[PDB]
């Protein structure tokens, strides 16, 4: 059991590698949302967003801080209709709609510019194609082929922590220093890990 925030801040590759960089994300998906259409696809989008699905445990972070890091990955000052790319928050409950409103107000009085990101109750959220999921992971062949076989299959990797983690990594969001560390959680086999890091490593150089 844990929570769900769903975001909408342009395209998803970015803040799935930026949010799976984060302690307390437990997994993230990408997907579609904001739409009035059912079952939308990446070149049949109707109405929808770009959206980002938050897996998080409110024990270790809160929705605030997801609100804080969803408003400095993107500046939404501008007043746009393109629905693909525009700034939303679904939120699932009135305490999430309260606490985006808050926020919102709070940075719109210290920067004196108006932030258009739209506060709506989300409906309903649709996974996008498997191609676009763990973006920058997934084209790293591999590292991605590896953690796959070890995680047993395409998707149990995506709906992974360390999955998350590593695709964050590649992107440029998390060090490999804290990389190691959440390697380290799963409790690999020693040669598994070993044969991971060394990918990493020289990731790395």
């Not at 909408?8 to 930026?18: M, T």
């Not at 190691?180 to 040669?191: A, G, I, N, R, W």
């Given at each position: 059991?844990?929570?769900?925030?769903?975001?909408?801040?342009?395209?998803?590759?970015?803040?799935?590698?930026?949010?799976?960089?984060?302690?307390?994300?437990?997994?993230?998906?990408?997907?579609?949302?904001?739409?009035?259409?059912?079952?939308?696809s990446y070149y049949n989008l109707g109405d929808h967003s770009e959206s980002i699905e938050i897996q998080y445990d409110a024990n270790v972070i809160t929705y605030g801080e997801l609100l804080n890091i969803f408003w400095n990955l993107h500046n939404p000052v501008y007043e746009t209709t393109n629905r693909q790319y525009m700034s939303r928050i679904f939120?699932?409950?009135?305490?999430?709609k309260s606490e985006a409103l808050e926020m919102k107000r709070q940075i719109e009085a210290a920067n004196g510019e108006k932030i258009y990101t739209e506060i709506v109750p989300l409906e309903n959220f649709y996974l996008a194609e498997g191609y676009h999921q763990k973006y920058y992971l997934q084209n790293?062949?591999?590292?991605?082929?590896?953690?796959?076989?070890?995680?047993?299959?395409?998707?149990?990797?995506?709906?992974?922590?360390?999955a998350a983690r590593m695709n964050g990594y590649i992107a440029g969001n998390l060090s490999?220093?804290?990389?190691?560390?959440?390697?380290?959680?799963?409790?690999?086999?020693?040669?598994?890990?070993?044969?991971?890091?060394?990918?990493?490593?020289?990731?790395?150089?």
């Open positions: 059991k844990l929570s769900i925030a769903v975001f909408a801040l342009g395209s998803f590759w970015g803040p799935d590698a930026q949010f799976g960089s984060i302690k307390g994300v437990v997994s993230t998906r990408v997907g579609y949302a904001g739409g009035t259409t059912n079952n939308p939120y699932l409950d009135d305490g999430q790293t062949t591999k590292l991605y082929q590896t953690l796959k076989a070890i995680y047993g299959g395409f998707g149990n990797l995506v709906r992974s922590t360390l490999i220093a804290s990389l190691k560390e959440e390697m380290d959680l799963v409790e690999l086999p020693e040669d598994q890990y070993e044969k991971v890091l060394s990918i990493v490593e020289e990731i790395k150089l």
